[PDB]
Design a protein around this ligand. Structure first.
Ligand SMILES: O=C(O)Cc1ccc(Oc2cnc3cc(Cl)ccc3n2)cc1
Ligand SMILES: O=C(O)Cc1ccc(Oc2cnc3cc(Cl)ccc3n2)cc1
Lengths: 424, 426
């Protein structure tokens, strides 16, 4: 068969021998089907790249809409395998309208059933907006639109495998299992640099926290890189992770990392996936020539996302959480389920020397020039004696517990396990 | 510091004699009061610019939250007057936590009661995100937000800021009803404001204001941001309506990242508060970013589809001149469950212009033509593509346009369809 054969692609994605067409095969450029993905009933449609390059027409779209109606009624996940130049120019507005009805089915399914898009060939026009309306997009390299794609696979068959694993993360979420959690505990603090000033890649820490025998499905890895988000499993339970990555921009929030984080929070809240929020944030950055508009609009959306969130969400402060960004990274004010901190963590408005410079500016300015840098250094010292660390914040109430890093998984798992499935 | 006194500001804004303080005055930096705005019971709080520059502390933030809880429980609009350089640094993390509680309260009220911000002085850090979380932000010229599209309305001065803020309380909380007799009394040949040439640009805003009531302001939002897309509140036979209109005077009226994002916010906002939408469409395509980045238009284009698709208030579409391709779908089309779709008689509903389509469907019949005749061949080929495609008559057949209307009854036909649709469903 041709590699682009739709029934070939539906068969590679589904469990062997499980495919069951939902309509007679034809020249419409779409084939839809019921199958299983590791036992889960799944609906899937494939565009037929062999007919008119997969251009969508009235009858192809009517198959997709029917497949959505089938999947909405079964409460089944629906997977779309995409390879299409867009709408069929010759069918005119009728095809435009039918493509519109595809979007309207995707909007109806939104947050109801999970929707995965596996993009395996050229995808343009209505065939780029289609996937943009689903929850997760997997793109085979065989296919400039930054932020739109979530997971880049190695190739067409690797794309079907990540797509299969997404189905299992969304419809086979599991229970937290306190006993596996403690079997996996390690000293995650060891992965930190000995200098609090040195930068590091936070992904090893995300990898330490999550189960050893399961991949970490990082979303949008190359877009907004000061922020890491993705799905994984924590003691067998599907969890969503969000983590400032101090290797990029010093781990600060900005307009794009706020958007990446906020869209992910909303996605997990929609399907009941609890969140682990690993925090190491020194502040936030503006735009390209100093425009705060994006970080204000996008940062508000991030607040809104955590604010309205209703799944368990637990925060772990590894090193430092400063100022306005402290609030946005799932803080107590915004109803975080629990807030943990590693023993050496700092919860402050800014650095101690930066904060003394402002708080005692008049004092500092009145002092002789041959004693300022000496008084500033010492003023900063008594400042950290009363502020800065976990002990201050524990007393205020914004950190619930100082935890030994060797017990991060247990503490996180236990905190997640006693929240309700909803309300926060 | 008289100019900036909270109780003076709180009363230049409320109805004369209505201010009832919610707590006893102090030096916290916030005064919160009850009162009325043209009769509507309203809560309001003012940061105290004459105390530490209005810097926000634990006890001023608690006033704002109790103000929010009062307004939420009374189902009353809550107006914030902002002048503050940020959180009190001497209060440390206690104040960060208290600022966040203000945010959380603004998020609880979201969609539920209207929230209007009047930014009268500088507003930075914590006091910049406050307004960012509310529904409409008014800004007087003697101020700024710092730490664009963040600010919806620019005022002529502080007293004008309070005046525009008071109209907004009245637009959200005194929505009125439609009136067939008033609507017809306002009909005009709206088609006459177009240019006679089908490719000239025009400012859409005289069209909009000729649909809305003849002497009621049109409170445009974000006019200098994403200017290929006009949105705002006005009144239509006396009922509050929201308007979205493509503006052919900027970027040919196309959609792009900012215009899609502009429309999607505004649609979700009218939907939350029960405000019908009038979508005036004249859109020929959509455009990528400066470096040919389509990521913006895709993500934010999709959010527009989602806004209209999930929308439940009556939303009527009028095709003035042309509507093309993917932008046609997103601009409140039948496929997204528009309440009703009207077109003026000359309008075009097509995948693309006839010459564009014929250039693709017949790339090879034209490339093979002799150069001096390949054009007569293009124009005759296009003329027969539009004996079939593009017109309002074809679109009525397909069923994507519900009625072709005389432009002289635009206002009364839009009113009628909004009035007779269910208040929810769609
Ligand atoms: O497939 C083709 O050749 C024609 C085509 C192109 C795109 C499209 O879908 C959409 C969806 N949403 C959109 C939002 C915006 Cl703001 C702008 C454009 C949008 N276009 C449907 C059909
Ligand atoms: O008041 C001061 O002087 C310090 C201050 C500054 C900002 C702030 O509030 C917020 C809210 N949301 C935010 C979202 C992002 Cl993504 C980044 C920063 C954010 N900051 C609270 C306090």
């Amino acid at each position: 068969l041709d590699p682009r054969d739709p029934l070939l692609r539906l068969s590679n994605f589904f469990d062997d021998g499980s495919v069951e067409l939902l309509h007679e095969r034809d020249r419409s450029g779409v084939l839809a089907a019921a199958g299983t993905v590791n036992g889960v009933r799944t609906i899937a449609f494939c565009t037929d790249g062999t007919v008119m390059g997969g251009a969508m027409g009235v009858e192809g779209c009517t198959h997709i809409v029917n497949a959505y109606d089938t999947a909405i009624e079964d409460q089944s996940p629906i997977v779309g395998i995409w390879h299409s130049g867009g709408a069929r120019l010759a069918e005119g507005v009728r095809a435009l309208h039918a493509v519109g009805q595809v979007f309207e089915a995707m909007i109806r399914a939104s947050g109801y059933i999970p929707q995965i898009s596996v993009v395996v060939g050229f995808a343009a026009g209505g065939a780029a907006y289609g996937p943009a309306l689903t929850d997760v997009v997997v793109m085979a390299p065989e296919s400039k639109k930054s932020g739109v794609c979530h997971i880049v696979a190695d190739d067409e068959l690797d794309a079907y495998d990540r797509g299969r694993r997404l189905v299992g993360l969304f419809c086979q979420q599991g229970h937290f299992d306190r006993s596996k959690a403690e079997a996996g505990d390690t000293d995650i603090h060891a992965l930190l640099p000995e200098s609090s000033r040195r930068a590091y890649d936070v992904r090893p820490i995300v990898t330490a926290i999550l189960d050893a025998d399961t991949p970490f499905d990082e979303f949008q890895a190359n877009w907004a890189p000061s922020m890491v988000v993705g799905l994984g499993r924590l003691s067998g339970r599907t969890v969503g992770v969000l983590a400032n990555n101090p290797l990029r921009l010093g781990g600060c929030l900005n307009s794009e990392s706020a958007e990446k984080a906020a869209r992910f929070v909303r996605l997990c809240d929609a399907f009941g996936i609890p969140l682990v929020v690993v925090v190491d944030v020194p502040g936030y950055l503006p735009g390209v020539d100093q425009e705060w508009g994006g970080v204000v609009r996008r940062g508000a959306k991030l607040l809104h996302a955590f604010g309205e969130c209703t799944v368990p969400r637990v925060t772990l402060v590894t090193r430092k959480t400063y100022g306005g960004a402290y609030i946005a990274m799932n803080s107590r004010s915004l109803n975080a389920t629990k807030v943990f901190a590693w023993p050496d963590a700092e919860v402050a408005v800014m650095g101690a020397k930066a904060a003394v410079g402002i708080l005692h500016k008049k004092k500092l300015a009145a002092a002789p020039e041959h004693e300022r840098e000496a008084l500033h250094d010492q003023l900063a010292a008594e400042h950290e004696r009363i502020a800065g660390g976990v002990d201050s914040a524990l007393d205020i109430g914004v950190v619930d517990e100082k935890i030994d890093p060797a017990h991060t998984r247990s503490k996180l798992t236990e905190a997640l396990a006693q929240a309700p499935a909803r309300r926060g």
